[PDB]
């Protein structure tokens, strides 16, 4: 990690996730004039595989003065199993 | 002699450091010039519900 020209710490964006108590977390990311804008909204969801039917507005969340070009993005995941010992099944989380 | 060199960079980037914005008292129910976070105007401020 070099030229660390920005650091931000605050309360969690994703609250505690501790059976079918699924949650919908919707976010919007924008890169305008070097400002990185994140909007979000959260709602418990009930037995809907895909996006549901309805209207819910996302409230503004964070405007970062980062000011550097962005072209790509990728999501970050959690390794509950072990890399050296990948079990046959049930080591992960409900497939 | 303890010495410090401050180099300010004002270039094409979102500004992160600035001088503090000092304020005055807030007066209501009167015709006044108001300036809230750069929003300028002239008018009467009243308690709104």
């Amino acid at each position: 990690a070099n030229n660390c020209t920005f650091e931000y710490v605050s309360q969690p964006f994703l609250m505690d996730l501790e059976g079918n108590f699924k949650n919908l977390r919707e976010f919007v990311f924008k890169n305008i004039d070097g400002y990185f804008k994140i909007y979000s909204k959260h709602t418990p969801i009930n037995l809907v595989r895909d996006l549901p039917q309805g209207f819910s507005a996302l409230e503004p969340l964070v405007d970062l003065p980062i000011g550097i070009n962005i072209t790509r993005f990728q999501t970050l995941l959690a390794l509950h199993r072990s890399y050296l010992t990948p079990g046959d099944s049930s080591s992960g989380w409900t497939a | 002699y303890r010495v410090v060199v401050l180099s300010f960079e004002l270039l094409h980037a979102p500004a992160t450091v600035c001088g503090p914005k000092k304020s005055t008292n807030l007066v209501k129910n009167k015709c006044v010039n108001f300036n809230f976070n750069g929003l300028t105007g002239t008018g009467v401020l009243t308690e709104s519900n």
Side-chain angles (χ1 to χ4, degrees):
Chain A
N2 310 52
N3 186 340
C4 251
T5 189
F6 197 103
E7 159 74 7
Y8 193 97
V9 289
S10 100
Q11 65 165 69
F13 280 174
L14 306 112
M15 35 148 298
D16 293 26
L17 273 294
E18 261 72 358
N20 202 337
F21 193 26
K22 279 321 223 174
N23 288 335
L24 285 169
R25 292 177 179 82
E26 329 187 50
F27 308 71
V28 171
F29 315 131
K30 313 177 51 187
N31 255 85
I32 321 284
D33 319 297
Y35 300 86
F36 188 88
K37 295 189 192 186
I38 292 176
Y39 314 77
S40 95
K41 169 94 163 183
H42 171 275
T43 303
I45 178 187
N46 178 261
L47 308 163
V48 175
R49 38 172 300 188
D50 67 292
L51 285 101
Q53 203 59 46
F55 204 84
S56 154
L58 310 197
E59 295 81 1
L61 188 72
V62 157
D63 182 30
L64 284 197
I66 54 96
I68 283 272
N69 186 278
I70 301 203
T71 295
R72 295 220 315 254
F73 103 93
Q74 177 211 169
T75 181
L76 305 181
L77 292 323
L79 325 182
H80 293 246
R81 69 192 167 275
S82 98
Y83 35 79
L84 252 182
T85 317
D88 280 78
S89 210
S90 324
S91 188
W93 262 109
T94 78
Chain B
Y1 279 47
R2 278 188 171 175
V3 57
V4 170
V5 173
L6 292 168
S7 59
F8 311 106
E9 56 152 72
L10 200 140
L11 292 87
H12 300 293
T16 71
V17 301
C18 53
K21 291 338 161 192
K22 225 61 172 87
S23 62
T24 85
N25 212 336
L26 174 67
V27 40
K28 318 130 79 163
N29 296 111
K30 279 163 77 298
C31 169
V32 290
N33 316 291
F34 53 87
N35 197 67
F36 290 58
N37 290 72
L39 177 58
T40 88
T42 60
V44 179
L45 329 168
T46 57
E47 294 280 16
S48 194
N49 47 14

